[PDB]
């Protein structure tokens, strides 16, 4: 069974009673791909990290080693990828 680990981050760790950052071991169903993701806000050029973690099999993340947002100008950016800790760094485009 393929293993996957992602960077974990939660800006609302407090109100959610969770760690703020760390590592997350992903668990997937059989034959299902495993991904990581990052989400953040970009207000006034200042990047505000919202969440990072594991993400279930989703074709939008297939075979991407880099985590790149695929939405022009959203209020909340998102990217996902397929590789261990591939959400460590992220960019827009």
């Amino acid at each position: 069974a393929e293993t996957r680990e992602c960077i974990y981050y939660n800006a609302n760790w407090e109100l959610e009673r969770t760690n703020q950052s760390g590592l997350e071991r992903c668990e997937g169903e059989q034959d299902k791909r495993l991904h990581c993701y990052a989400s953040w806000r970009n207000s006034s050029g200042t990047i505000e990290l919202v969440k990072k973690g594991c993400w279930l099999d989703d074709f939008n993340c297939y075979d991407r080693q880099e985590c790149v947002a695929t939405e022009e100008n959203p209020q909340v950016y998102f990217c996902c990828c397929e590789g261990n800790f591939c959400n460590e760094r992220f960019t827009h485009l």
């Binding site: 993701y37 989400s39 989703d58 959203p74």
Partner: protein
């Protein structure tokens, strides 16, 4: 017309009008189940003892409906969305994608 099986279905959140609270994904392949559950119920058809009994009954009492083709195996997908307070939330929604169908 056709036998009970999986059919394609892409749910596009913009078309449902949810692209404002769902940050990701833009949509997903949900699929659906459709098709007849004919007598005698085909082996390869995933069928419960009840569906079998009902199918037999329907063969001699048309007032009793046939079994129905529905999802018997499903998988989850992750979604990222904004709650009432514009706060970002992660949820792995279970049973969102039809993996296999059967007569029930």
């Amino acid at each position: 017309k056709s036998s009970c099986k999986r059919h394609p279905l892409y749910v596009d959140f913009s078309d449902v009008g949810w692209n404002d609270w769902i940050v990701a994904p833009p949509g997903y392949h949900a699929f659906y189940c459709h098709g007849e559950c004919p007598f005698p119920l085909a082996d390869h058809l995933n069928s419960t003892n009840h569906a079998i009994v009902q199918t037999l009954v329907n063969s001699v009492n048309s007032k009793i409906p046939k079994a129905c083709c529905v999802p018997t195996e499903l998988s989850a997908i992750s979604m990222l969305y904004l709650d009432e307070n514009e706060k970002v939330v992660l949820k792995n929604y279970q049973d969102m994608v039809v993996e296999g169908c059967g007569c029930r």
